[PDB]
């Protein structure tokens, strides 16, 4: 069928408005389903690499909103700590809000 990768196309879309709307949809659906959230963590991590600052901020806020059930791995943790290095203060504050609620499995992650 042609419905495969709908959210893949949405998050890879060239307009940041479409990507922000996709982020909101991911937020609502993840608040509904935890398994879908676990599946879609990686795409949110990719959005943390997004070139538009607002998209990064909103994706981080949604990840914070849905962190209550998921638990990350070492790949996710190093990628998240990577974007925290960035210069802009507001996105760093957003990462700080994220880490307040994020889960972790290994002590080495901490």
């Amino acid at each position: 069928s042609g419905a495969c990768g709908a959210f893949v196309h949405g998050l890879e879309d060239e307009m940041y408005e479409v990507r922000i709307a996709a982020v909101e949809a991911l937020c609502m659906l993840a608040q509904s389903s935890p398994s879908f959230a676990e599946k879609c963590l990686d795409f949110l991590v990719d959005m943390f690499n997004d070139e538009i600052e607002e998209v990064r901020l909103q994706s981080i806020h949604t990840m914070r909103k849905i962190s209550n059930n998921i638990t990350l791995r070492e790949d996710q943790l190093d990628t998240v700590l990577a974007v925290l290095e960035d210069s802009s203060r507001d996105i760093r504050e957003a990462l700080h809000e994220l880490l307040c609620c994020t889960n972790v499995s290994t002590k080495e992650g901490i």
Partner: protein, 122 residues
Amino acid sequence: GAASSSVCKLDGLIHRFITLLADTSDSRALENRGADASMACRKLAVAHPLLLLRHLPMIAALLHGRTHLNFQEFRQQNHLSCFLHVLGLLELLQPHVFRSEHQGALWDCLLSFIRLLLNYRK
């Protein structure tokens, strides 16, 4: 009273030994160190079982941490040695680990064990 806001004169030392027990690598020298750690911890278990059970959530968290790693690295890193050591220690803390206070960390350890069983059932 084991859950009280109190400090044991020996707790830090058994913490040191349980860190030595859990932390291991492929090194046979570190495996000998872990075997000695299991020996001392087991002697403390049979001698002073209540002291170890106060540190149960710690080793439970370590068991939680170590469970994800795939079977091949699990066997090569000797993590099965750690798993059988903690399982034997829990067996040797038999009539006291089933209390209400130790129930949560016990369930955590059992959760780690069953997660290991499911992941490497092949």
